[PDB]
Design a protein around this ligand. Structure first.
Ligand SMILES: Cc1ncc(COP(=O)(O)O)c(/C=C/C(=O)C(=O)O)c1O
Ligand SMILES: [Mg+2]
Length: 500
């Protein structure tokens, strides 16, 4: 059902648990990111870490009714306590409530002050939110909704099933080396917190962020959600600069965090070189391989910890959030990581895990088709030099050599292409017949106006645009996430949107 125009504001793919929404023209994107009230009434849905799901809102309203006067619901009491502490709220702000036979955890937020915004930021950047499947079960058990979303799940020991599938994909001995977390960000935060804890005793409290990477991961460090010092090395290819910054912090580096490729710039770092730097520094190397997938790259040999957002291609359904932390068995940190990791983050609600278990069965087959489609579309984009200025991806001239160092023999580039346009985004995006909106990694082709999603605030002024320019980004860019449709149909769809 891909490659069609979807009416503005419709949840995408359509399930109650949809993580995306149709935002099909730039005017609507601007209205959505600027919180224009008319746009938000027409397009009220959103990615569940960014716009609270209606069932979560309703559960929060009803749980608060039993002082009635804002309540931020979380995945766990642990997550609520962490958000309250980060926000500077009293410990009593974190509370356990009840509704429909269920225990709920959340933080009571103050009306005034910055505490409300900080608590929401903590839950958001760490992926510690209550899921829509859990809220749906609360409401259904309480008799407050008629029915539940019908969907395929694999309910027999789903966490073991998912962990075993990922152990095979990453090439680790078994599920003991794979921890499931509430979302990709919950996995990243758990990995960073675990490494930080293990490294604290030796005086290592500083992190190096390699390049510009996914915005929530950057916020974890910039906003001190993880209480560490950090330095960003803006050029992920500049290994001499990485070594210079590491030398400045010699004996003091807890870890280096990197992405392969990076979101959304698509830069591929040199993981074998980073491993040697990390070894010399005595620090851990944490790699987020979401965009490549373990079916395309073999990065466990070079990383101490690998993280993945299973929300994306691992499921291909755009309807469940989950994350994975994979511990490298040969890492010197491996034993301490397996001891310490259970203290950080939260496993997903089991019904979410059961959805992952059903959807992950087709991961390898999905990536075969996705890879072929990305290759076909990349050649198409090169053939439109009057409209497409640049395309950044794993096999471009910047990244191909580094990608080849870790690519599997059958491995392809994954599904993402970051398209830099010579024309205003409107002239391509508005007419493009794909699902347009947040997230990526579905079996239908998607596109995101990703600089608006990540950095709307910086797009709004000359100095903000100069800052984005320094990162290689500007307004008129489209992040394409290819699905599994026939390649000729994807190519034709883009040809029609690229021509005048
Ligand atoms: C590399 C990488 N690592 C971690 C995450 C967080 O996953 P979740 O916590 O499951 O949301 C993302 C998510 C990216 C988007 O949501 C998007 O860019 O549309 C990512 O690209
Ligand atoms: Mg460029």
């Amino acid at each position: 059902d891909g490659l069609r125009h979807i009416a503005a504001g419709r949840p995408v793919p359509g399930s109650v648990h949809s993580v995306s929404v149709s935002i099909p023209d730039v005017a609507s994107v601007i209205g959505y990111e600027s919180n224009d009230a008319a746009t938000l009434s027409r397009i009220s849905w959103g990615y569940p870490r960014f716009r609270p799901h209606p069932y979560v809102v309703r559960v929060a309203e009803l749980a608060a009714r039993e002082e009635r006067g804002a309540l931020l619901l979380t995945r766990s009491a642990r997550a609520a306590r962490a958000a309250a502490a980060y926000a500077g709220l009293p410990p009593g702000a974190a509370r356990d409530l009840t509704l429909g036979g269920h225990v709920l955890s959340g933080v009571r937020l103050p009306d005034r002050g910055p505490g409300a915004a900080r608590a929401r930021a903590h839950v958001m950047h760490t992926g510690g939110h209550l899921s829509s499947r859990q809220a749906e079960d609360v409401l259904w058990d309480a008799g407050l909704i008629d029915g539940r979303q019908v969907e395929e799940t694999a309910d027999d020991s789903p966490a073991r099933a998912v962990a075993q599938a990922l152990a095979g994909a990453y090439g680790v001995p078994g599920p003991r080396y794979v921890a499931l977390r509430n979302s990709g960000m919950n996995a990243v935060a758990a990995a960073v917190e675990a490494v930080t804890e293990i490294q604290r005793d030796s005086g290592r409290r500083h992190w190096l962020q390699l390049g510009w990477i996914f915005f929530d991961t950057m916020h974890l460090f910039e906003k001190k959600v993880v209480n560490v010092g950090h330095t960003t090395v803006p050029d992920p290819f500049d290994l001499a600069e990485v070594a210079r910054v590491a030398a400045a912090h010699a004996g003091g580096l807890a870890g280096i965090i990197a992405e392969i490729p990076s979101n959304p710039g698509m830069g591929v770092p040199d993981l074998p070189a980073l491993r040697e730097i990390a070894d010399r520094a005595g620090c851990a190397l944490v790699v987020d391989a979401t965009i490549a997938t373990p079916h395309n790259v073999d990065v466990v040999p070079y990383a101490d910890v690998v993280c993945e957002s299973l929300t994306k291609y691992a499921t291909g359904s755009a309807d469940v959030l989950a994350g994975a932390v994979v511990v490298a068995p040969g890492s010197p940190f491996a034993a301490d990581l397996l001891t310490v990791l259970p203290r950080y983050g939260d496993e997903p609600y089991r019904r979410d895990t059961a959805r992952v278990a059903a959807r992950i069965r087709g991961y390898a087959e999905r990536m075969v088709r996705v890879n072929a489609n990305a290759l076909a579309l990349a050649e198409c984009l090169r053939r439109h030099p009057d409209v497409v200025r640049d395309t950044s991806w794993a096999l471009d001239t910047r990244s191909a050599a580094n990608y080849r160092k870790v690519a599997r023999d059958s491995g392809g580039p994954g599904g993402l292409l970051m398209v830099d346009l010579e024309v205003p985004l409107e002239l391509v995006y508005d007419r493009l017949a794909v699902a347009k909106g947040p997230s990526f990694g579905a079996e239908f082709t998607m596109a995101s106006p990703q600089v608006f999603v990540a950095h709307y605030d910086l797009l709004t002024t000359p100095r903000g645009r100069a800052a984005l320019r320094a990162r290689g980004l500007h307004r008129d860019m489209l992040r394409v996430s290819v699905g599994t449709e026939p390649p000729e149909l994807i190519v034709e769809t883009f040809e029609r949107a690229l021509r005048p």
